[PDB]
Design a protein around this ligand. Structure first.
Ligand SMILES: CCCCCCCCCCCCC/C=C/[C@H](O)[C@H](N)CO
Ligand SMILES: CCCCCCCCCCCCC/C=C/[C@H](O)[C@H](N)CO
Lengths: 283, 242, 57, 245, 147, 49, 242, 57, 46
């Protein structure tokens, strides 16, 4: 050892809690020095005063389960993400995969920062007035980089490699399972920065917040036949979320959304978070 | 093959149903996970973190909404005035809508357990005073004077070095769970009225200002729980996004 | 067995999942764990604070 | 007996006599990247003295009607010191931080500051006022450098989320009647083990005055605020010629 | 009703044959199983897509055929056609109290009871379970009567 | 998969049939029961009064 | 028989689904197999075989495409000139489209691992010289001179008896996998720029020609992998075959 | 058992295949083997070349 | 010239760290590459 210079802690570990914690009995107390009612919120720690340190309590054994508050049961519900119509007029549509088009699922997923999950997609398809007509349809998923079909009878519809479903209108709705497919370790709904290098100007200002680890290609449907079908079609896509793991919670949004790609809000009507009242003394 | 029959419940699409579906990518492998700090296993870990309560939600504070987080306390000439009052319903609209607890209770229907409300004084160093914070179980309205309000659960606060006190709101109810209170028939699930009174005056020497402010923080205790998930009504979608 | 490819494999959930295919992400959700850790969100403080003592002395 | 504190790292030392406790964000110490999570094959470089030290930024002025300020990390340190050089000559970095904010006043003033560290702070616009424009923030707003920018609508944090529940992030208070400093220790939080320092900004630091500063006339009407930060376990990889941005 | 959607308040005392059996006991505790049989008002069958949605008390309700409440991000919902076998679901015991009661002697609220508030007598909020909403799926007006 | 056939009796709604149906609330827990006096287990206990 | 229900996902034709189907020939037996040499068990055995790289893909070489495989090196009068430069994206169009690795990466989307590029000198015996081959990680453009380009990973090549050198391109990236780089947003997955410079001059005696050529070979290392199979776009079918 | 008639019987793939009929070519594909041999395509050379030594001396 | 490919790794040219990777090679097998249904014929009866 010629150089004496070169030779040279987690805080809390998790545990299972099936039920809510019980309440133990207590009595009155008269003493000096010990005080649980006085805290200091300046340190950023929340208070640890229970019920028994302020009043006298009895003994209550509660068996209230905390199962419904887990993240698995909170997210595993199918929600609407897309409405796709074929009046587009040539019997096919190419829809870019973006799951931020409807505000009810966007608010729940933006509660966390990083998320890692597997999905399950379901397609419910009918006419624009709910009417049913026997008709053959084809769905095709196109990964990013793959060629896309430009016509109703292109060579991309041969599906030699692409996953695809053939389903009729009179059938039960189709269901598929999709694994976690990002190049990174988790999806993120917020990306503070620019994706590319080089100079950032007013022509390239729309790049701010677009992370390529979330762009998953496109999605294409068509009527199967080579001619023009005489019916209008409308597709609704529902997505469930399975095997959820989340990280780094955030405040929830209280302003209404404006676009799918940026958190811009309306600058004139800033909505106050609570409903206002008249006086501070009268409820 | 084997004889079967199809029962009722066939070919329905149940959104909260859990089943096995066919995969689209055989032999696929995901990216291996790395250790990222701050993993949330349960939604009750967020409900114990205190956030700011919006007590001063007046009609004149809608164009300057930075003042709704602090409510003032000044020098009085009389004794026993009240400074603020609000309901203790975490699910009803009002001051509790600004909390991370009040926004997470909207995604459920029934809740149980006890709360806590932490107040923090933010005046000068030379100023002093004593406040009385009382919680009254339902049956009566807001008390007209201090000598009525001191009958419920109450805590006397003293300003000094420790500038924070926690009034715990204990769980006193007839049912095991409580739905979201509202005007009509669902006010049967109301939980009480929280007021705050001047125990003594707010005494200040010469050279220090005569008006201070108090911020209020709210959180849940360890025996808190929820059930019966539903959707919130705070968000909407009238116009189409993008 | 099955070539295990899910979203939750390092720290996972309960062992009651049902699957008929060969890929593990086709399986059901099952019932969840009851594990939780509150103190890394409510007490992120280096020096330990006891509830009896004054916190700022 | 815990109101005094001393932090030393590198060749720098910070002392305080009226201090709150130390906040470790999410209860994790910053550390070097282990081999089980690594993906780069090149051997990383660790300067380990010249970048693990306290760097002092500029000083703002707290008035009676101030809104609030924010700094983007690690954009604040990318043009100063040898850490400004290793982040210009490499492609990947990885480091924790340790934020220390000082603001002191006498016993006759009053006010309250809320310090908070917020990861992935994506800013937004007011969308042209009426809400029909797809506006975007310019480069001078999103990455201000070591000066830092002011806030316009602090009630919504210029990102659509309210101030009222910002405390779910790691945070502390600077109350002018008890203490005068606040300190947070932040580990490295990202989906990938290394990242570029010129195109990605990990977190934002927000200092927002909740209770306004008030005093009687005649006192010192000049209340300054000074931020001091320090990287913890900095590593770098992927050497290439100097590119500033 | 004529706009392609109805909002029906959950009250299981509308038909006397089941009301007489359940009123034989005072307190009851059970889990249910619901089945929906749907056709035209003359028994005729037409291929048609339908959606059922259960709305808990406190949740927002849909006011139109194409409202934002029909996205069902949290609410349990079934999509079923007319030509299919009838749908079936299972519902657990969901009262805040320990058992349902069919008789409640008193007033639900405090305060003064007068002739304007006399209809409150006998309304227990442990039995009000929200509402129930169906609609035709499409955004236009369907040409058939449903029952 | 496995070969099957559907027998007669398919797609009928029998009102006194006992079977297994799908649930709508995963992970739900009811209110815990308390002891209430006067439990009736059988309808023949009333016929002797 | 046994009561069942049909779930969603019934009567769909999933092209990547794996199941059991009914046979048409009962009791059939195939022809017994014989031992045929050269069995491929995995597609990564082909990706380690070097093929020729098309560095000299100019617009004037479209009518004489035999010259696109060799790029020339001649006697310079000045010092420190660069002879060639290209991107190191195996999936982007350009010089890597002519390889068996570049055609096999098109059938997938995400790849990982390190590469290698082998150069082979094909001049006379009496000729000599030294070349510098550098690989620069992304962030900068092509370097303007030699003294900028020598900062990245680089190898100095000497002509002699051994006429082949291998510059290995190590895997330096932020993500575990990389998608196919392209102009737009997907240039975030770019991987660098490979240049080549004159270390010294190309010195030739009298009687031997003053212009030689260099061929370039490319392959993958042992830690190479791919995922998420898709179709290529290099082939097409506009007119019907036959 | 079943009269074994597949395409891959001499050197086969993993043992997780499912079948309900009597002929083995009706069975599923299953998961595959991880076996590979690179050196009969990248090093088809009689005299062995070491990576340290000069190859042409 | 001998027709053998090179055997130089990363560690023989530069200095490297230690990296344990768990990238599977399942998708590159010939079974998963070919077991996908593709179109082979269009047959019409006018
Ligand atoms: C036959 C199956 C077709 C369905 C294919 C679905 C695969 C695409 C799944 C994408 C998973 C979510 C990825 C990112 C989601 C959001 O759109 C982005 N974060 C946008 O910010
Ligand atoms: C998708 C499922 C939708 C069906 C939802 C049904 C949930 C509602 C079940 C209520 C259970 C009985 C509760 C009270 C019954 C009587 O209406 C009241 N006692 C009236 O006196």
């Amino acid at each position: 050892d010629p150089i004496a210079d070169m030779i040279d802690r987690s805080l809390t570990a998790l545990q299972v809690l099936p039920t809510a914690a019980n309440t133990e009995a207590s009595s009155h107390r008269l003493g000096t020095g010990v005080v649980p009612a006085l805290q200091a919120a300046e340190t950023g720690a929340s208070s640890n005063a229970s019920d028994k340190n302020l009043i006298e309590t009895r003994c209550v054994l509660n068996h209230h389960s905390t199962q419904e508050t887990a993240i698995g049961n909170f997210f595993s519900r199918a929600g609407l993400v897309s409405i796709i119509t074929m009046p587009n007029t040539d019997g096919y549509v190419n829809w870019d995969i973006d799951l931020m088009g409807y505000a009810q699922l966007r608010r729940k997923c933006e509660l966390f920062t990083y998320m890692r999950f597997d999905a399950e997609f379901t397609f419910v398809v009918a006419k624009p007035n709910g009417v049913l007509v026997p008709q053959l349809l084809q769905y095709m998923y196109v990964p990013p980089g793959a060629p896309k079909p430009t016509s109703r009878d292109s060579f991309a519809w041969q599906t030699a490699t692409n996953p695809s479903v053939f389903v009729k209108m009179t059938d039960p709705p189709a269901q598929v399972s999709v694994p976690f497919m990002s190049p990174a370790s988790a999806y993120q709904w917020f990306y503070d920065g620019y994706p590319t290098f080089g100079e950032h100007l007013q022509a390239n200002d729309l790049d701010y917040g677009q992370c390529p680890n979330n762009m998953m290609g496109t999605f294409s449907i068509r009527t199967v036949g080579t001619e023009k079908s005489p019916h209008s079609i409308t597709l609704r896509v529902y997505m469930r979320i399975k095997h959820v793991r989340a990280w780094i919670p955030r405040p929830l949004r209280n302003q209404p959304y404006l676009f799918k790609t940026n958190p811009n809000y309306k600058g004139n009507d800033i909505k106050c978070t609570s409903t206002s009242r008249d006086k501070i003394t009268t409820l | 093959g084997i004889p079967t029959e199809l029962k009722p419940g066939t070919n329905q699409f149940l959104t909260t149903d859990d089943g096995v579906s066919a995969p689209i990518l055989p032999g696929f492998h995901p990216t291996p996970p790395i250790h990222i700090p701050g993993e949330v296993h349960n939604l009750l870990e967020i409900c114990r973190v205190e956030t700011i309560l919006e007590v001063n939600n007046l009609k004149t504070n809608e164009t300057t909404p930075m003042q709704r987080l602090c409510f003032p306390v000044s020098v009085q000439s009389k004794t026993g005035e009240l400074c603020a009052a609000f309901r203790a319903d975490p699910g009803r609209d009002g001051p509790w809508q600004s909390t991370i607890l009040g926004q997470l209770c909207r995604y459920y229907t029934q809740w149980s357990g006890s709360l806590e409300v932490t107040f923090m004084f933010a005046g000068s160093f030379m100023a002093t005073g004593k406040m009385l914070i009382a919680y009254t179980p339902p049956g009566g309205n807001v008390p007209a004077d201090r000598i009525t309000a001191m009958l419920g659960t109450h805590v006397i606060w003293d300003f000094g070095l420790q500038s924070s006190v926690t009034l715990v709101v204990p769980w006193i109810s007839n049912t095991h769970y409580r739905a979201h209170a509202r005007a009509g028939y669902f006010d049967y699930y109301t939980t009480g009225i929280i007021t705050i009174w001047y125990q003594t005056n707010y005494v200040v020497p010469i050279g220090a200002p005569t008006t201070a402010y108090i911020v209020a923080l709210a959180a849940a205790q360890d025996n808190f729980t929820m059930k019966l998930c539903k959707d919130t009504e705070d968000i909407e979608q009238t116009a189409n996004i993008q | 067995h099955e070539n295990s490819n899910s979203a939750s494999e390092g720290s996972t959930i309960n062992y009651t999942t049902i699957n008929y295919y060969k890929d593990a992400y086709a399986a059901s959700a099952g019932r969840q764990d009851m594990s939780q850790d509150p103190k890394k969100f409510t007490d992120p403080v280096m020096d330990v604070i006891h509830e009896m003592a004054p916190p700022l002395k | 007996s815990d109101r005094v504190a001393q932090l030393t790292i590198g060749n720098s030392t910070i002392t305080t006599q009226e201090a709150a406790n130390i906040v470790i964000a999410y209860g994790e110490w910053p550390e070097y990247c282990p081999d089980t999570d690594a993906t780069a094959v090149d051997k990383p470089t660790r300067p380990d003295v010249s970048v693990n030290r306290f760097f002092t930024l500029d000083t703002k002025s707290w008035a009676k009607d101030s809104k609030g300020w924010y700094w983007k990390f690690p954009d604040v340190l990318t043009e100063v010191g040898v850490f400004g050089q290793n982040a210009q000559f490499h492609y990947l970095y990885r480091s924790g931080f340790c934020v220390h904010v000082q603001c002191n006043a006498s016993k006759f003033h009053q006010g309250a500051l809320l310090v908070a560290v917020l990861p992935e702070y994506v800013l937004g616009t007011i969308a042209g006022g009426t809400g029909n424009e797809n506006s975007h923030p310019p480069y001078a707003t999103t990455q201000p450098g070591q000066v830092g920018a002011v806030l316009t609508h602090p009630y919504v944090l210029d990102a659509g989320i309210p101030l009222s529940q910002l405390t779910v992030c790691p945070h502390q208070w600077i109350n002018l009647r008890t203490n005068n400093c606040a300190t947070i220790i932040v580990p490295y939080m990202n989906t990938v083990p290394f990242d570029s320092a010129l195109n990605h900004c990990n977190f934002g630091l927000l200092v927002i005055p909740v209770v306004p500063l008030d005093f009687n006339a005649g006192a010192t009407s000049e209340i300054p605020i000074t931020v001091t930060i320090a990287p913890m376990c900095a590593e770098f990889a992927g050497l290439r010629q100097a590119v500033k941005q």
